[PDB]
Swiss-Prot record:
HAMAP family, per database record: Ribosomal_uL29
GO cellular component, one term: cytosolic large ribosomal subunit
GO MF terms held by the record: rRNA binding; structural constituent of ribosome
Key words of the record: Ribonucleoprotein, Ribosomal protein, RNA-binding, rRNA-binding
Protein family: Belongs to the universal ribosomal protein uL29 family.
Mutant lacking the gene: phenotype: Cells missing both S17 and L29 grow very slowly and have a rather unstable temperature-sensitive phenotype.
Function: Binds 23S rRNA. It is not essential for growth.
GO BP, one annotated term: ribosomal large subunit assembly
UniProt gene name: rpmC
Name of the protein in its database record: Large ribosomal subunit protein uL29
InterPro entries xrefs: Ribosomal_protein_uL29 (IPR050063), Ribosomal_uL29 (IPR001854), Ribosomal_uL29_CS (IPR018254), Ribosomal_uL29_sf (IPR036049)
Organism listed in the record: Escherichia coli (strain K12)
RNA sequence: GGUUAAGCGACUAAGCGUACACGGUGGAUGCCCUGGCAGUCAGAGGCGAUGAAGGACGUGCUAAUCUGCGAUAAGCGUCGG
């Protein structure tokens, strides 16, 4: 996914980041409620957030 | 054969002893090595304010401990195998 995400800019990657944070919250609410079933989506979204933050820190200037 | 008298007198085991058979307990002996000990031949001889040694807390689909890791948290990018 990093190859696709490198095309995006600092804005439109922050938007992506915030959207994955919203999705992570919603998955957390379903999971904690005990009505998620697909328990593996939490690993998927967390690693996606880590990827977006890595690309942000790369494009910051360092 | 009957009665009496005299003499002698086996068989008892509440428990115990010894022998043998079979058991219980217990964890020696034998065999074993993912642990150690002593060295040889090579390395390396340091880490730390770019925050160490060592820790607390946390981190999973996780209830706990160990291992790894640090709010990007059993992990993120890139390059090779």
């Amino acid at each position: 996914k990093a190859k696709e995400l490198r095309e995006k800019s600092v804005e439109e990657l922050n938007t992506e980041l915030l959207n994955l944070l919203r999705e992570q919250f919603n998955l957390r609410m379903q999971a904690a409620s005990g009505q998620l079933q697909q328990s593996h989506l939490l690993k998927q979204v967390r690693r996606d957030v880590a990827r977006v933050k890595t690309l942000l820190n790369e494009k910051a200037g360092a």
